[model samples]
Target: GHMAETAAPRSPAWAQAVDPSINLYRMSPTLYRSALPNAQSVALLQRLQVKTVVSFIKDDDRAWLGQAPVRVVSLPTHADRVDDAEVLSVLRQLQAAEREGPVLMHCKHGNNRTGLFAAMYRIVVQGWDKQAALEEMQRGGFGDEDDMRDASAYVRGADVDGLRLAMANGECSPSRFALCHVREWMAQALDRP
Candidate 1:
């Protein structure tokens, strides 16, 4: 089957050169649409000594090459909207893993799901304001505010219900392409206030 092109790296780019202490290598969490392999990703992870990789991309289990012992955790959910419950679950896993080592959270292209998880980590665990946390994620290259709005609305309006909607129709009508079919319907069924 065909896959989408990997999203371009977000701004505030990591040093092309390596940093020894920082074992974390963040990436845009998405599938590779093109034929070209992600040499940059492989190189960066190798340079950083990344041991575990948390991904939100579905079917990633089959896609990843067995180069190193990278722990792949699926945090799959709606893209256009954020599900607080699901986000919390991911956060818990991340928090528990904190003692082990630095963890990398990625999703297809590393923007939407990564941003949501990172933002929630800042806000829920680090005591940052939601907006501020979101901005921080943006600074790290998290784009797509419209998706944020949908997530925000879901969190504020109906919580799980909002997530349902986001899961179904997506945050907006136009951005429906951002969601997969099963998740979309699930979001819609759950997204009402």
Candidate 2:
């Protein structure tokens, strides 16, 4: 469990996020995962042309959001304590924002929590098998062994994407844009038994 944070974190450890090859790892073409970013990372993010950011480090600011042409989506949870409900919620949002441009998602070290969400997103949207999803997350330095195993089990047993969308709107259809799906995903979290 984490203490409730009131504002932006002042941790400077995530400064290396400027280098796309450092703590950053690309998940899909439009989605990349990394650690937190500081003021210096904005120029690098601009060069990388990132469009959206999903920050999950329980702090509101990544320290460089205003400078870059990036939209920030905050999805804070306790460090690595994210549940299935939390994971699905952000995946749906990331799915929608990614329609606009490449998104850079981050937690502290770009592992554990970030890996869980990234891998689960791949499973839900890309229809990846459990092995394939974990494999990519592992190769990208995205998760701990135990966390990766747990995420694998959770995602393998879960089937909420289509159902979640249907509940949010009328039905789950690819013809619909992703925000419709995101609403259902959020509703699913609150309404799930």
Candidate 3:
């Protein structure tokens, strides 16, 4: 499985890139999660070919992300607070976005806020509870250090097409909620498949 995960010409490594260990998980088949994508992670964007990027906040570097053909919808919030209205909007937005294609959702570090909204999405939208919705954070591509290392090596030797594809896309993302990372987390919390 990881053989393909690290296939070359798909995820080139970068010295200054975001931590490759930062997983952009597939909570289901459509929804995904991660921290703020560093320049390195941008490579996966091309292969995954995200249709939209739902961001929790904005940074100066986010401008560089504009290189992709992604449609961004930002819902700015602080690390300490989770606005109800903003969370509702994202749920509604996702309600619509999920019908189209895949959606990559993220905050700054795949931390509390990302968990918040991810959990909320499951609760209100999928009829999940806080415990289960929290899994979004834990449902990354790999869990062990050995795998993480292998992935690192793989991406470093991975393809150039991944990075090149980013420029072909449009601007994308918004939202910083720690509400999620529960269900996906719960799903794998014990006796996992």
Cand. 3 TM to true fold: 0.48
Root-mean-square deviation per candidate? 12.8, 12.2, 18.5
Clashes of 2: 0
- Top candidate, metric lDDT: 2
lDDT computed for candidate 3: 0.47
Candidate 2 structure quality by residue, lDDT tens digits, 1-193: 1324342234323222335443564445556767755555565566667767654323223334443446556563345324455556677877788677777777665455565666557667667666545433444433444555445544543447634543555334332223334322322121113
The candidate that wins on TM-score is: 2
Tens-digit lDDT track for model 1 on 5-46?
Answer: 243344435212122222233332211111122323544554
Error of 3 at 13 (Å): 26
In the range 51-110, model 3's lDDT, one tens digit per residue, is 566653333223444455454554433343233433465677765776767676777653
Q: In model 3, which regions exceed 4 Å deviation?
A: 1-21, 56-63, 126-134, 137-193
Candidate 2 has its poorest 10 consecutive residues by lDDT at 183-192
Any idea what lDDT model 2 has?
0.52
| Deviation in Å, model 2, residue 121 alpha carbon | 0.5
State the C-alpha lDDT per candidate: 0.43, 0.52, 0.47
Q: Roughly what TM-score does model 1 have, to 2 decimal places? A: 0.48
Report the poorest 10 consecutive residues by lDDT, candidate 1: 28-37
Those runs of model 1 whose alpha carbons end farther than 4 Å from true positions after fitting are 1-40, 56-63, 76-82, 126-137, 140-193
